[PDB]
Each structure stands twice: as C-alpha cells, then as structure tokens.
Design an enzyme around this catalytic site. Structure first.
Site, PDB file in Angstrom:
ATOM      1  N   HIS A  41      21.382   4.911 -16.993  1.00  0.00           N
ATOM      2  CA  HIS A  41      20.794   6.104 -17.624  1.00  0.00           C
ATOM      3  C   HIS A  41      19.875   6.897 -16.673  1.00  0.00           C
ATOM      4  O   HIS A  41      19.678   8.087 -16.872  1.00  0.00           O
ATOM      5  CB  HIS A  41      20.116   5.743 -18.963  1.00  0.00           C
ATOM      6  CG  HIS A  41      18.716   5.220 -18.844  1.00  0.00           C
ATOM      7  ND1 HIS A  41      18.398   3.886 -18.995  1.00  0.00           N
ATOM      8  CD2 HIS A  41      17.543   5.866 -18.649  1.00  0.00           C
ATOM      9  CE1 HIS A  41      17.096   3.731 -18.851  1.00  0.00           C
ATOM     10  NE2 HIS A  41      16.556   4.917 -18.642  1.00  0.00           N
ATOM     11  N   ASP A  90      24.124  -0.352 -19.670  1.00  0.00           N
ATOM     12  CA  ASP A  90      23.120   0.383 -18.922  1.00  0.00           C
ATOM     13  C   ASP A  90      22.808  -0.312 -17.597  1.00  0.00           C
ATOM     14  O   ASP A  90      21.742  -0.911 -17.403  1.00  0.00           O
ATOM     15  CB  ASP A  90      21.859   0.581 -19.777  1.00  0.00           C
ATOM     16  CG  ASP A  90      20.939   1.668 -19.237  1.00  0.00           C
ATOM     17  OD1 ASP A  90      21.315   2.409 -18.285  1.00  0.00           O
ATOM     18  OD2 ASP A  90      19.821   1.798 -19.786  1.00  0.00           O
ATOM     19  N   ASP A 182       4.571  -3.476 -23.249  1.00  0.00           N
ATOM     20  CA  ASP A 182       5.949  -3.020 -23.122  1.00  0.00           C
ATOM     21  C   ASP A 182       6.202  -2.382 -21.752  1.00  0.00           C
ATOM     22  O   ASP A 182       5.269  -2.003 -21.027  1.00  0.00           O
ATOM     23  CB  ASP A 182       6.252  -1.988 -24.228  1.00  0.00           C
ATOM     24  CG  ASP A 182       7.745  -1.817 -24.518  1.00  0.00           C
ATOM     25  OD1 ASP A 182       8.587  -2.598 -23.998  1.00  0.00           O
ATOM     26  OD2 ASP A 182       8.079  -0.871 -25.293  1.00  0.00           O
ATOM     27  N   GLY A 186       9.625   5.666 -16.780  1.00  0.00           N
ATOM     28  CA  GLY A 186       9.377   5.463 -15.355  1.00  0.00           C
ATOM     29  C   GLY A 186       9.697   4.053 -14.884  1.00  0.00           C
ATOM     30  O   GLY A 186       9.990   3.843 -13.715  1.00  0.00           O
ATOM     31  N   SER A 188      12.218   2.330 -16.188  1.00  0.00           N
ATOM     32  CA  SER A 188      13.670   2.212 -16.326  1.00  0.00           C
ATOM     33  C   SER A 188      14.320   1.798 -15.016  1.00  0.00           C
ATOM     34  O   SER A 188      13.967   2.331 -13.953  1.00  0.00           O
ATOM     35  CB  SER A 188      14.279   3.550 -16.746  1.00  0.00           C
ATOM     36  OG  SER A 188      13.980   3.849 -18.102  1.00  0.00           O
ATOM     37  N   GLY A 189      15.272   0.860 -15.120  1.00  0.00           N
ATOM     38  CA  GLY A 189      16.027   0.358 -13.992  1.00  0.00           C
ATOM     39  C   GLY A 189      15.406  -0.841 -13.274  1.00  0.00           C
ATOM     40  O   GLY A 189      16.069  -1.491 -12.487  1.00  0.00           O
TER      41      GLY A 189
HETATM   42  N1  AMC Z   1      10.916  -0.477 -23.343  1.00  0.00           N
HETATM   43  C1  AMC Z   1      10.815   0.867 -23.934  1.00  0.00           C
HETATM   44  C2  AMC Z   1      10.928   1.911 -22.823  1.00  0.00           C
HETATM   45  C3  AMC Z   1      11.384   3.232 -23.401  1.00  0.00           C
HETATM   46  C4  AMC Z   1      11.419   4.279 -22.291  1.00  0.00           C
HETATM   47  C5  AMC Z   1      12.397   3.839 -21.195  1.00  0.00           C
HETATM   48  C6  AMC Z   1      11.987   2.458 -20.649  1.00  0.00           C
HETATM   49  C7  AMC Z   1      11.933   1.443 -21.789  1.00  0.00           C
END
Ligand code: AMC
Ligand code: CA
Ligand code: CL
Ligand code: CL
Ligand code: CL
Ligand code: CL
Lengths: 250, 58
Positions: A41, A90, A182, A186, A188-189
């Site tokens: 993504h 993903d 969480d 930013g 992500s990946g």
């Molecule tokens: N764990 C929730 C987050 C949502 C935004 C993208 C990264 C993950």
C-alpha cells in the site's frame, strides 16, 4: 509508533526508511544485503518510481552521524493478488540498486522458513514493531526511531475482542484495544519482529487498522509466513527492466 | 521427535523425515553444531542478531 519508546541506536539495525523525493514515505525490513520487505500500500500513489530511496543505519532524522547508507530502489515487486486501495496481500519486495554494507548499525532480519514461522514463531506472544511514524493519532511523526512490544492475537479472538475490512488468512492482529499503544501512519511497511532462542525473525509487516490506537481495535499486520516461498523465488530471479513488477501469487 | 512440538528441539529450522527421523538446520550465515540442534554464526553479521548487544554480553 504510539505509546512506545526510542529504539536505542543500533538496536533496530534491520529497520529501513523509505523516501520519495526526500520525504518520508514508509518503513521496511532488510532481510539480506540487497532485499527489503515493505507494504504494497506504500506504493499506491507513486508517480515517479525512479525517485524511491531506501536508507539503512538511520536513527535520528535531524542529523547525519555517518552510519546511514542510502540506496536507490531498483525494483518494487508486488503480488498479483494485491489490489491498490485495499488491504489484502499487503507486501512488497524491494531490490536495492547496490547492496548495503553490513555493519554494527546495518544488519538484516532473518526471513524464517514457513514451517518454523507457522509452528513456532506464531505462538511467541510478544514481538517488536518499529518506525518513525506518528507518535499520536493526528500527531507529528518521530525524529528518533521508536519501537513497541505488542502481543499477537489469534484471528478468532481478534474478531471477538474487536468492537470494515475482514481479517484474512494473509493477516494477523497485534497490539492493544485500549487506545494506548499501536503502529501509526508513517510506520507502514516496517517490521513486526519476533525473538526465538537468541535470534530475531520477520513475522509481520505494519499494514493497517481502524485509524491509529483506536479504542476497541488492534493493529493489523501482513502475515509474512504466507509469502516465504513467493519471496524466496523472487530473490533468485533476474532483475527486469522497469521498477514496478507485478509477480504472480501464489 | 517432531518439529511441531517444541520446534523438535532445534534452535532454528526443523524437517521431519520418513521414520522417527528429524533434521535441524540453520539459516545462511550459521552452522549446525554436533549436538544436531544448535546454530552458531559463521560470519560477522548474521541475520537476526544485534551486534551492540552481542558485544555487550560477549
Ligand atoms: N496500526 C494502525 C495503523 C493505521 C495507519 C497505517 C499504519 C497502521
Ligand atoms: Ca541520522
Ligand atoms: Cl535515472
Ligand atoms: Cl529468472
Ligand atoms: Cl532500467
Ligand atoms: Cl520505470
């Protein structure tokens, strides 16, 4: 990352920062000297593929200390089953244009065998997720690399405890439902990394969720064990002209 | 022994074989010890180890 701590410099040495025109795009995981795993993504809105940079040995974004190594991303490989704008499958495999140099600050994470990952790693409760993402929902991104210990949930129990995309067999939940802790935008990946008998392994990829640290919801992670053979085959393949490659999955 | 229980005693990877036979294996950059289960680094920077912490306890 929300509710974590600074990863002491060098203690997250597989962490990758992905840049597009010098701007923060995503995280990633180094799995050997030329290959990086990220999230599909991350590339949904890329226009010039030739402006993607991977940085290893990074820690504090405000300074250069000399441990950083930057490489052009030569290939981005995404499974045929991924549909942009959606969440399933993903995963992305990145080929660096030149290998990075392994150092105290740049070390790959082990890509586990599938069976080991399914039979053993999947039952390690806590794993580490890291990034320079937002420190708060709707907040500023981190200047120092952050890391967070998160417990994994069986998918039945994730669905039961959560309270809108499905949780497929290519995903897993991890984290907390109380809005304290969480992965965030930013991040992500980036790696979800799991310790077993002295060694760390790649088990997940920061993928998605219902916003960041939303009460009643957990972070969703790409289940890397479903992709081990797919990745392994591609790492043995010759490069192809053009950055983006869509490759059949399975 | 079987790989689905206790990782078959292997430190890393585990294959089940025809008979009551199990084989442990190690990732690239490691070698299997004579105990048949343990993996030891063969290179300076093996995957999944954190040099500043390995040096901290060496
Ligand atoms: N764990 C929730 C987050 C949502 C935004 C993208 C990264 C993950
Ligand atoms: Ca820096
Ligand atoms: Cl060019
Ligand atoms: Cl080929
Ligand atoms: Cl080209
Ligand atoms: Cl191109």
């Amino acid at each position: 990352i929300v509710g974590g701590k600074v990863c002491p410099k060098g203690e997250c040495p597989w962490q990758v920062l992905l840049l597009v025109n010098g701007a923060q795009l995503c995280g990633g995981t180094l799995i050997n000297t030329i290959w990086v795993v990220s999230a599909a993504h991350c590339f949904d809105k890329i226009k010039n593929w030739r402006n993607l940079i991977a940085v290893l040995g990074e820690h504090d974004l405000s300074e250069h200390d000399g441990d950083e190594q930057s490489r052009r991303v030569a290939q981005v490989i995404i499974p045929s089953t991924y549909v942009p704008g959606t969440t399933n499958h993903d995963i992305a495999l990145l080929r660096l244009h030149q290998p990075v140099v392994l150092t105290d600050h740049v070390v790959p994470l082990c890509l586990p065998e599938r069976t080991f990952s399914e039979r053993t790693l999947a039952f390690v409760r806590f794993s580490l997720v890291s990034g320079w993402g937002q420190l708060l929902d709707r907040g500023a991104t981190a200047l120092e690399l952050m890391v967070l210990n998160v417990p994994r949930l069986m998918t039945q129990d994730c669905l039961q405890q959560s309270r809108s995309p499905n949780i497929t067999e290519y995903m897993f939940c991890a984290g907390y439902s109380d809005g304290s802790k969480d992965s965030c935008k930013g991040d992500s990946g980036g790696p979800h990394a799991t310790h077993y008998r002295g060694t760390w392994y790649l088990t997940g990829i920061v993928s998605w969720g219902q916003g960041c640290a939303t009460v009643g919801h957990f972070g969703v992670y790409t289940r890397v064990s479903q992709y081990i053979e797919w990745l392994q085959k591609l790492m043995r393949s010759e490069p192809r002209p053009g950055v983006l490659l869509r490759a059949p999955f399975p | 022994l079987i790989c689905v229980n206790e990782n078959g005693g292997c430190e890393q990877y585990c294959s089940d074989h025809t008979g009551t036979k199990r084989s442990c294996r190690c990732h690239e950059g490691y070698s299997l010890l004579a105990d048949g289960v343990s993996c030891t680094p063969t290179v300076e920077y093996p995957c999944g180890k954190i040099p500043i912490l390995e040096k901290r306890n060496a």
